[PDB]
């Protein structure tokens, strides 16, 4: 999807 | 008090592309802006110089800030490894917004992203602390090397950075 994460990047 | 302006010089596989300068809203989020400012001068002995934008998705954002592992999993703040979400007064209103990447509530480190579009779905979850003041055309040029899955086709680095004002 469109997220901005550190560690587990999700869809 | 005047809000600090910080700059990054971007290179694409070692070739300089241009300078992007940012205004940081220390008058609304002093602690998050200070973290980004000290990491851009390198004054604590570590920081953004020489690190890369590891994940760029055209139409969404450019993400970087991992100066420890370099692969998108690390980085840290000037306050210890992670710090709190200072406030969510500002939103992700359009291109140019500077905001913190995280891994859920109160996990701010050094990673950050520059929005190339309004991303209202991140409001209240990622702390907005700055904007592109000059050099939005350099950010637009950076998107050309990203992809829908975020991998870049060239190594985009912060060749130099520091504080202007």
Rg (CA), chain B: 14
Active site residue B144: no
Spell out the SS3 assignment of chain B. CCCCEEEEEEEECCEEEEEEEEEECCCCCHHHHHHHHHHHHCCCCCCCCCCEEEEEECCCEEEECCCCCCCCCCCCEECECCECCCCCCCCCCCCCEEEECECCCCCECCCEEEECCCCHHHCCCCCEEEEEEECHHHHHHHHCCCCCCCCCCCCEEEEEEEECC
Placement of tokens 């904007």 in the chain: B131
Segments forming the whole domain that contains residue B63: 1-165
Placement of tokens 């994940």 in the chain: B55
Q: Which residues lie closer than 8 Å to B59 by C-beta, 6 or more apart? A: B116, B117, B143
Count of pairs with CB atoms under 8 A, one residue in A, one in B: 33
- Please tell me the total count of domains within chain B: 1
First to last CA, chain A: 4
Q: Is B137 on the interface with A (CB under 8 A)?
A: no
The CATH number covering residue B59 comes to 2.40.100.10
Q: Give dist(CA B8, CA B157) in Å, integer.
A: 9
DSSP state of A4: -
- Burial of A9: CB neighbours in 10 Å, binned 0-12, 13-18, 19+: middle
Q: Chain A partners of B128 at a C-beta cutoff of 8 Å?
A: none
Q: Give dist(CA B59, CA B138) in Å, integer.
A: 14
Q: Is B60 on the interface with A (CB under 8 A)?
A: yes
The candidate with the shortest Cα–Cα distance to B139, out of B105, B164, B116, B165, is B116
Q: Resolution of this entry in Å? A: 1.9
Alpha carbons within 13 A on the beta-carbon side of B120: 1
Pairing of β B112-115 and β B61-64: antiparallel
């Amino acid at each position: 999807x469109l997220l901005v994460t550190v560690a587990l990047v999700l869809a | 008090m005047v809000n600090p302006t910080v700059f990054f010089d971007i290179a694409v596989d070692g070739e300089p592309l241009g300078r992007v300068s940012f205004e940081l809203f220390a008058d609304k989020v002093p602690k998050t802006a200070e973290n980004f400012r000290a990491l851009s001068t390198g004054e604590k002995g570590f920081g953004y110089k020489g690190s890369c934008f590891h994940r760029i998705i055209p139409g969404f954002m450019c993400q970087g800030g991992d100066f420890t592992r370099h692969n998108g999993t690390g980085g840290k703040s000037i306050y210890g490894e992670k710090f709190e979400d200072e406030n969510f007064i500002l939103k992700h209103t359009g291109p140019g917004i500077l905001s913190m990447a995280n891994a859920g509530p109160n996990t701010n480190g050094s990673q950050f992203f520059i929005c190339t579009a309004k991303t209202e779905w991140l409001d209240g979850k990622h702390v907005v602390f700055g904007k592109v003041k000059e050099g939005m055309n350099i950010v637009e040029a950076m998107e050309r090397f990203g992809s829908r899955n975020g991998k870049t086709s060239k190594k985009i680095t912060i060749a130099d950075c520091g504080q202007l004002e």
